[PDB]
Amino acid sequence: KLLLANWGLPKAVLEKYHSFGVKKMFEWQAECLLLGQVLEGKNLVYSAPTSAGKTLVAELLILKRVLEMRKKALFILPFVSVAKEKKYYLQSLFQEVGIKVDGYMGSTSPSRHFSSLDIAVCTIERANGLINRLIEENKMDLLGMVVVDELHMLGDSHRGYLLELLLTKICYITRKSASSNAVQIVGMSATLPNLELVASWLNAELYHTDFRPVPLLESVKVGNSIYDSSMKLVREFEPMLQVKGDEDHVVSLCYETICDNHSVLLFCPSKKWCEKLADIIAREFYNLHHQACPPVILEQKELLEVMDQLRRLPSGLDSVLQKTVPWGVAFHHAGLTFEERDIIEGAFRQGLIRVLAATSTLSSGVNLPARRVIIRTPIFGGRPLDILTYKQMVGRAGRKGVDTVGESILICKNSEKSKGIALLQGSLKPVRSCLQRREGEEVTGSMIRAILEIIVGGVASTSQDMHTYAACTFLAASMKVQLGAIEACVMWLLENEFIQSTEAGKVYHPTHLGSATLSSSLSPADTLDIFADLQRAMKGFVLENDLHILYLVTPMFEDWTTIDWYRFFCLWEKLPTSMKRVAELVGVEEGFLARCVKGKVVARTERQHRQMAIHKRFFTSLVLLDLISEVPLREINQKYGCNRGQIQSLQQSAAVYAGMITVFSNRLGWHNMELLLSQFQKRLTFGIQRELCDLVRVSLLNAQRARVLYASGFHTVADLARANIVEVEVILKNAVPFKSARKAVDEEEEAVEERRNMRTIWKGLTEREAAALIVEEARMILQQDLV
Amino acid sequence: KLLLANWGLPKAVLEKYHSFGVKKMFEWQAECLLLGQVLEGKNLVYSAPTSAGKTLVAELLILKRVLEMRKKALFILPFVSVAKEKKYYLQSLFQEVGIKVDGYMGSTSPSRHFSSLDIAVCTIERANGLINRLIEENKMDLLGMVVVDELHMLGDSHRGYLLELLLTKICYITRKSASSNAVQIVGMSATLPNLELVASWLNAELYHTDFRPVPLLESVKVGNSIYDSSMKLVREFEPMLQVKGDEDHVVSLCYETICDNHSVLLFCPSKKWCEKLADIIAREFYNLHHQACPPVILEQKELLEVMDQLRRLPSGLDSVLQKTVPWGVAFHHAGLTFEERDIIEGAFRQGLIRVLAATSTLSSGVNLPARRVIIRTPIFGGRPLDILTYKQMVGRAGRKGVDTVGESILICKNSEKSKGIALLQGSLKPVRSCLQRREGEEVTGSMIRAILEIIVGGVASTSQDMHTYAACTFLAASMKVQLGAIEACVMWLLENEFIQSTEAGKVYHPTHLGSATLSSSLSPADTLDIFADLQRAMKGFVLENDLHILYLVTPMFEDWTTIDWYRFFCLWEKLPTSMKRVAELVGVEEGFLARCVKGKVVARTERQHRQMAIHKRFFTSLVLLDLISEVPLREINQKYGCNRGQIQSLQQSAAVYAGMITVFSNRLGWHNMELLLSQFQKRLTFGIQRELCDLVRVSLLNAQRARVLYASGFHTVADLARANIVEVEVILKNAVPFKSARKAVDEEEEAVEERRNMRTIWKGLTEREAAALIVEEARMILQQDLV
DNA sequence: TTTTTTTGCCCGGG
DNA sequence: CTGTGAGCTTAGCGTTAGAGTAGGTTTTTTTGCCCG
């Protein structure tokens, strides 16, 4: 029977599914669950269209196996948003059963240690981290099920190949003893050409379907000609709205369906192009009630509440959104602050917004269905669009039940027509393993990390064991020089001190730099950079300011932003000698800054790669310093060029890097440097104690200045209006870390002015004056708060 | 009544007195207790000769006050040795009544906060510290008494002026409390002139006596004749055993009384001459028996134990004590290690040694009575002997029940004879406070400190309060320049940031540098060096090795040794680059050391008052680095020119500086420096753990290189003989902090070469060899253990 | 011409 | 590498910036102390 009640679920879960509004399974879900050995614990891989109840199968398999066996089930997800979504959803299903559901994702982590959980939801990197901890604890016996979503990610060399490493380690360490299935794996994937090879690699039952609740019409617009997937001409397009300077009539493609109250989604090659088209479409829709075609109903009093909520936010209401949002038009790209993204997505999900320009950010990691998807070009970023990304984009078409059909138009030039058709009539590439070397190529970083994670984990200490591991990879399954690739990795790992060549055959063991890389879950290519910095700090370290810790803690990135090397070069030359000293030690150099402004950005070498890495890391330190130096965000945007979305990506990554490089120092045994880093980690907590934000009402208090007046005397502004101006001066003067206003002998006055300046306040005032002004400000606040 | 039982003592203490001493008070003690107001709680000064029953009156006054008034006393003593002796004495005397006697002295401190104690036996430097902490905590009401010994010290510029400050602060705060006593001061002093002035300052009763249980027959020897103190000729000398070996015939003056079974104590100017002269005297007892008045009774049944009790010491039986001690002849000076002195204290107190040459270490701080004192010259060092020393050296002449009269003989040439007569017929100079400026002299550092302590404790806030305080000093009594001294100090503090100026006249407050100077109880004149070294080391701190953090905790002294600049230069040229960097980053300079080789003495200025005082502190850090490197002391003493008695005082002193400067860096707010110092503090500890001490001897293992074995679990030589060489190799390779062998880019070859040296044991071994030898040496020692 | 002795601070395990 | 729109704000016109995404340990509220 398709009715889910007939499957004998525990009634709490059945009632929750009924409350979630799903009561019957789809036929493909019954056929998948009835595969004979799957319910017996055989591994499974199934590919079905996204949304469409795809996860319902994996949820029922988890539910049974965690009830049939007390072992823990691990749910691995590609992104923190979908991880958090699935965590709270699974909690609402299972918590009434008494199942403990928590997860590892972002800076979120379980309230109590992994022993307490029954189901863990986590990101790929949190999953591969947890497995290394279960191996080191030798508590791998705890792991009873491992559910992998988006199993096609194995080919993504940047991240996602860790999904191959993770499953290879689970298979190897189990089959090392198993030679009734101990760790049932479930994969969820795409309609890959070689999906059955992945199923054979996992020794899994294979199921695949094409069923989707709302059928999807692919199409191309070529001039005015609209072609279906079979290239039958469905229409010659007529623009209902004539637009200045528009050759593609995207505004007519929007308006044609808006006439029936159906929302539109418009994928654009870039942030700028999203804002341009959200502006244009808003300016055309603004004309309608002046010039008028059927009427458009906007429920503008709801958009007033939406747009007010953007005004409430400390970001403020964006100057483009002022123009577009009143008319139900928005744009949505990663340069927005995360609360702005949630407001815009929420207003779309309620149907208040009706047209939404977006970059790829609504293709991956956000689920928002719309009746009509529009893709602005077949070329993205000066390259042809990836077929995987295209097929994710179009899958946004159609709300379940609300739409009878989902529509997608690829917009294309007649000059592009072949490149257009190639996306519809092409198909996904075969999945392949990033462990595979090209014949002429160095052994890949994915293999090097793969070998490191066993040796340093206390597993497979000999090359006989490593080959017995290596033959378990999907590289091996794909193949049925590779026999030499393991011995090339250990040659590389030895030459970079990650492992010890214990002898008398040979046996390999972790160095500290091994256990550090593993315990921090850094890439071996990152710890070559982080270590060569951290070792250079040990030679000579600046304690007097924060910059020389931020340089060690600041996240590694490649092109976190475009860097204007001239505004960096000038901003370096402006640095105080207090902090210009840090630049001297860190290795920022006039010769490289001058070449970065004057030349083309210089090519890499063994030396010049780290030289570049220092500068790119140092520039990111200044931005992170300005964030802790309490520069208002609106200034930093001008000062460096990084938008307010990138700044949150840096605030998130920097805090985590403090924890990682504390632990990296512990495993190295550098317990002095580790204690500096562990105490600095207390200061990268950017979260405002909003209880202090009362004192923040007076302009003269930074968060520390408020907290020290919150600490000393528990000043409310109502009490700061009552304070003795000299007592405020005393409480300020004795809150700061002491810096001598005297020159010391054999200093230079540059340094002495900076110690004085570091105690002046706004550089322009001294406490003997400012302590009066702040009491005057407090009574000027109080007399207004009373009215 | 002289019978102690009539005074109403608690019987436990009375019977303890019967056990320890005698049932009757001396005739003078019943006078001093019956100065009519003393028993009512009036302050008291008294003087009695050379500890002949001196302290019994003070101890009885403590017992009365602490039992009946029930407030907490503070007993202030000039040395830790005297303080240690008195602590056990006052414990064993009072503890049966439950008086919670403990004390603050050296590294020793009570197991609980002050509020638990009833008597705090205390050194001077730690009594001032404790008074400050009472003032800062506003606990000064807890103090019920202070009792003071050697109150004639107030005139010393180097120490003991603290005893003026301490009593001034007690008087000042008492008067501010009063403006039957809140505190009773009992002061014990030499028979000074102007002692009535000291008594008048404290508003105290006065007692003086010349009473002795054993009279002193002072004399001087000149030209083979003896003269009385009254310059009566006693006799022409009767030289026996007369020999050319030393024409002053010291050997005759010693042996002449040895015939009576009574001991000789022979003070000499210097260790080199003292130790030499005990060897000469031992050769004469050799010359007697090897040619045998009677030959000296050697009692070798005990000397052959005591002399082997020295062989058991980590430095063996001293290479000169080997020659002299078989005869009952010894020497005792502060160039011997502390245990050698404590043993020789026993061997003289039991009378097994009969001739003991000494420096002034037996003059003050330890009480070894002997029948005849001999003083080899009126000159000591480059100057005439201080009469306060002479009248203490000759004070050693009598032991209450063992002999009937004490003797002393100063030895003089026929020339310069009057230099001795001025010692015989002289008397002590009147004591004058070191606060006293000369009219043309820049105000003295002991005044500057006195002004600081009252500001930072906050009991004197204004210029009026500091003129009111100054009227409580002993300077004020001595002057009946004071008007210009107080303001000139408040200027000098301001111009060095110890204090701050505010309005509502001017009112003064401590900086953090004030509270750091006071809480470390450093001298203000020292804090200007210590802070300058910290400030220059918040820059450019070398975390790679301890030498920099040693330099910040190295004790600073005036000529802690004479420094051989050529040997220091030969060390500085030869340090590892990782340490030669630390030399540069504290200002050690090749051209300066070249100058100090070219000439030791120069005109100076505050730049040169740093330069010649940076290097002297760094040379002392080199010695501390060798101690914590576990270098053999036989090498150290050869390497630097230090000697083994100093080294043990440096070990104790450096363990103090690391704990003061942690409080210094705490109260400056330099918390990122505090948590480095507070971590290195734990490693300045040269003892051995409860269970390691037997293991660390064997297989040539350094303390932690042994401890890392025991850190795996309890292990013994029998276990180290069983362990697999490869298991120990991994255990050793897991012990060290990581130090990469790779050369970094932008690094010198010499800078990595040290990291590949720092890994080696010592003949330099890697663990592949040493982890075998450690087991082979263990099993071969086990083959000597089992037999 | 080389050359005497002395002293400071904090808190642990439970 | 390959590619294009709208790019700057000069004045009406030329030619350039450009997607989104992830890691770590430790893990809650309060005065006073006593013993090796």
Swiss-Prot record, chains A, B:
Positions with a binding annotation for ATP: Q29, A48, P49, T50, S51, A52, G53, K54, T55
Annotated region described as Interaction with RAD51, given as residue ranges: 746-787
Tissue: Highly expressed in testis.
Chain ranges of the Helicase ATP-binding domain: 35-210
Residues covered by region (Helicase activity): 35-470
Documented effect of changing K54M: Abolished ATPase activity
Motif (DEAH box): 149-152
Record PTM text: Phosphorylated by PLK1; promoting interaction with TOPBP1 and recruitment to DNA damage sites.
Domain Helicase C-terminal stretches: 245-470
Subcellular location: Nucleus; Chromosome
Recorded disease: Breast cancer: A common malignancy originating from breast epithelial tissue. Breast neoplasms can be distinguished by their histologic pattern. Invasive ductal carcinoma is by far the most common type. Breast cancer is etiologically and genetically heterogeneous. Important genetic factors have been indicated by familial occurrence and bilateral involvement. Mutations at more than one locus can be involved in different families or even in the same case.
UniProt note: domains: The loop 2 region is involved in the binding of the 2 ends of resected double-strand breaks and homomultimerization.
Assembly behavior: Homomultimer; forms homodimers and homotetramers. Interacts with RAD51. Interacts with ORC2 and ORC4. Interacts with RHNO1; interaction takes place during mitosis and promotes POLQ recruitment to DNA damage sites. Interacts (when phosphorylated) with TOPBP1 (via BRCT domains 7 and 8); promoting POLQ recruitment to DNA damage sites.
Summary of the function given for this chain in its UniProt record: Low-fidelity DNA polymerase with a helicase activity that promotes microhomology-mediated end-joining (MMEJ), an alternative non-homologous end-joining (NHEJ) machinery required to repair double-strand breaks in DNA during mitosis. MMEJ is an error-prone repair pathway that produces deletions of sequences from the strand being repaired and promotes genomic rearrangements, such as telomere fusions, some of them leading to cellular transformation. MMEJ is required during mitosis to repair persistent double-strand breaks that originate in S-phase.
Family, similarity comment: Belongs to the DNA polymerase type-A family.
Protein name (Swiss-Prot/TrEMBL): DNA polymerase theta
Organism: Homo sapiens (Human)
Lineage, uppermost ranks: Eukaryota, Metazoa, Chordata, Craniata, Vertebrata
Full-protein interval shown: 68 to 892 of 2590
